[PDB]
Homo-oligomer: A and B are copies of this chain.
Amino acid sequence: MENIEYVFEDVVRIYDTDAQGIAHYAAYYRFFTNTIEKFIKEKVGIPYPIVNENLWFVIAESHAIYHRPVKLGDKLTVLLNPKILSNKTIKFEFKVLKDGELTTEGYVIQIAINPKIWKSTEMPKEIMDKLSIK
C-alpha cells in the first residue's frame, strides 16, 4: 500500500459503454481522471484540476493506445506514473489492466495556468515539493 496513491480501481458501468458494447473514448477519461485526482489529493493535498481561482490544470496533449477491449462489468485497475516535466508541466502516464493483463496505455500532459489571464504559470514550491516525494 506504499504506492497506493498511484493505483485506482473501478468497474465499467452502463454509461461507460456505447452500442459497440465496449467502453468508449470518454470512459477512459473518467478512469484516468479519477486516478490523477486521487494521486494529487493524497500526494499534494489539494483539489484537481481546479486548485484555486489563480491556478488550474488544463490538458495540453493526450494519447492512448487501446490494445484490448474492456466490457460492461469489467473491474479495471489503473496505474499512474507522473513525470514532472517542468515547474509548469506534468505528464501523467497511465496503464489500464484487467486481471493483470494490459488493455490500454497512454498519457495526458497537463499545464498549470492562471485562468484569469489564461496563460501558463509556475507551480508553487510547496506543490513541487510534495510532488517530488515518491
Contact = CB atoms under 8 A, between A and B. Distances in A.
Interface of A: 13-15, 17-22, 24-26, 29-30, 33-34, 37, 47, 49-50, 56, 58-66, 69, 72-73, 106, 115, 118
B58 A65 contact: no
Contacts of A21: 19
| Copy count, this protein chain | 4
Given A25-B26, A26-B29, A58 B20 contact: yes
A18 B74 CA distance: 15
Nearest to A118: B69
A44 to B, nearest CB: 15
Nearest to A56: B20
A48 B44 CA distance: 36
Contacts of A18: 14-15, 17-19
A133 to B, nearest CB: 24
Name which of A14, A15, A29, A72 has the most chain B CB atoms within 10 A of its CB: A14
